[PDB]
RNA sequence: CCCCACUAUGCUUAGCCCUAAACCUCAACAGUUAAAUCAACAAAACUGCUCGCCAGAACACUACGAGCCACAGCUUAAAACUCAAA
């Protein structure tokens with residue numbers, strides 16, 4: 132309200148490509164967490180429920196990052212069989 | 218006994234521990250140029266340490282400095298000051314097209 | 315008649331006992347050899363346990379006095395552009411050549427570390443060795 | 450005057466090398482599977498490097514090559530594991546061929 | 550010069566122009582994309598109203614006021630009244646995630662207006678009023 | 687059915703060195719083919735089914 | 736259940752009331768990783784020491800008594816009848 136306008140969340144259109152400008156803006160708001168924050172703010176999440184989800188999300192990220200690391204590590208040996216026939 | 222036996226000591230080949238870009242430097246709430254490097258250009262959102270690469274201590278100092286600078290009249294809240302858009306990009310985030 | 319309780323004693327103890335009890339009419343072909351030339355440890359099943367609290371493995375890191383010289387040499391001059399040949403058991407790298415000269419000069423009575431390191435580089439340069447400082 | 454094991458270990462090139470990260474070593478191709486080169490460089494485990502695009506035909510069984518070592522044994526401990534997972538191979542980057 | 554998605558900053562000396570007008574002088578299309586309606590007001594850089602259209606003013610009612618085709622129709626209507634007043638280039642400021650958020654912008658273009666920038670001003674409270682309780686459906 | 691004669695003599699020693707695999711003939715063939723592939727490296731359709 | 740409006744209430748102040756799945760459902764302190772690793776599951780298995788607590792189910796977060804700014808309240812907390820399970 133008290134800030135300058137046309138600086139925050141503002142994307143310029145290139146060569147009249149408004150679809151790409153809108154997608155860029157949508158990607159910015161998504162990465163910064165705004166799109167998902169507006170949605171969660173439509174109805175009140177009860178504090179006990181917010182902690183449960185924030186803890187589930189935190190643990191799914193740790194589990195997915197750890198499962199990706201394991202697959203990358205064990206994919207080094209995906210090469211062809213060096214001792215075929217034995 | 219025997220001269221060629223191993224000897225007890227600390228690892229001589231040990232490498233120094235990693236350091237964040239701001240390790241050893243004072244973070245002041247008046248240094249808005251530095252603080253602006255860790256907020257989103259479009260939304261002013263403070264970046265998490267997974268984007269800034271800062272350690273827990275400096276992530277906290279930067280966060281506390283930003284919050285102080287914002288409410289004391291030194292730093293905008295809803296966007297990165299456009300004067301600082303051409304500063305070195307030290308954050309691991311890719312936005313445009 | 316026998317025993318397949320592999321976690322109860324060892325094949326020797328189980329075999330010896332059943333021979334005494336008359337369960338085994340004949341000793342197996344290996345029994346007399348084991349008795350004459352037994353292993354250092356009797357092969358008894360054990361369950362490996364996980365360490366907790368203040369329990370730590372007794373294995374020690376292998377270090378040598380020359381490792382301090384090697385750590386400094388790699389920091390100052392980096393790894394030599396010459397390639398290690400680990401197949402030759404008598405291979406000498408630039409670092410090992412540096413360490414040997416560094417050891418000789420220390421035995422000549424010099425005790426300073428920063429001075430004993432600069433004089434060593436000069437000696438090798440005189441001998442034709444290439445020492446390109448990393449920085 | 451029989452050399453002890455402690456003496457062999459102290460004066461072995463592998464001991465003298467120190468850490469293996471970013472160390473240039475000479476390897477020998479001992480097994481080839483398509484474009485996968487299996488190279489022994491004097492360690493416990495071989496490394497596997499893909500045939501270079503340039504002068505690919507020069508890399509044959511017995512060809513001696515230059516490597517930049519990264520790890521002598523690729524191992525990692527994953528969450529909920531009591532020991533380390535090992536792929537039983539060294540990590541190295543193939544630079545080229547060694548010539549006299 | 551390379552294209553910058555960042556808008557020109559007022560007070561600096563930019564070379565960008567639209568019909569000889571600077572970014573600060575281009576009229577603004579304010580799109581309110583609600584869940585059940587879409588409202589579009591075009592104003593001048595001095596905040597003079599030039600055109601207004603919403604799905605309700607275009608004859609859509611009740612569950613029809615909140616669709617993509619209804620917002621697109623409202624955009625065309627606002628573009629027509631704005632074009633008569635001399636508007637060609639507009640800056641779009643959209644607040645809300647309703648169904649007419651993007652469709653309302655298309656209608657403005659089909660109506661003859663050229664969008665030079667897009668700004669989101671969806672209200673996000675930084676801690677604010679407590680929202681209503683979840684609907685039990 | 688040509689079940690092979692007892693695969694060991696009177697002393698009980700099997701004749702074939704791969705007896706204890708249970709598939710000595712199959713693995714003896716795989717061993718011979720794998721060995722030929724090795725020797726070639728050291729050295730280096732419609733008609734039938 | 737959905738929509739609209741609105742109240743006690745959520746806030747502040749000054750007093751009360753004293754409850755929770757008040758739960759890491761893990762008492763405090765100290766020690767150990769060797770023995771047998773260990774009913775099961777949870778959350779690797781234990782030792783010393785101390786306090787608190789428990790002794791079939793249900794009756795029963797009940798009755799009576801007592802105390803309490805509590806008055807349709809809280810704390811402490813039975814018995815009879817009944818069952819061969821819980």
Ligand code: FES
Nearest residue numbers: 236237240272275
């Ligand atoms: S790593 Fe030292 S302060 Fe961040």
Ligand SMILES: [K+]
Nearest residue numbers: 756758759760
């Ligand atoms: K709980």
Ligand SMILES: [Mg+2]
Nearest residue numbers: 742743744745
């Ligand atoms: Mg009220």
Ligand SMILES: [Mg+2]
Nearest residue numbers: 676677746747
């Ligand atoms: Mg308040």
Ligand SMILES: [Mg+2]
Nearest residue numbers: 179755757758
């Ligand atoms: Mg709680």
Ligand SMILES: [Mg+2]
Nearest residue numbers: 762763786787
């Ligand atoms: Mg206590």
Ligand SMILES: [Mg+2]
Nearest residue numbers: 772773774775
């Ligand atoms: Mg068990």
Ligand SMILES: [Mg+2]
Nearest residue numbers: 790791792793
């Ligand atoms: Mg009872």
Ligand SMILES: [Mg+2]
Nearest residue numbers: 754755796809
């Ligand atoms: Mg109660």
Ligand SMILES: [Mg+2]
Nearest residue numbers: 796797809810
């Ligand atoms: Mg009561």
Ligand SMILES: [Mg+2]
Nearest residue numbers: 798799800801
């Ligand atoms: Mg009473």
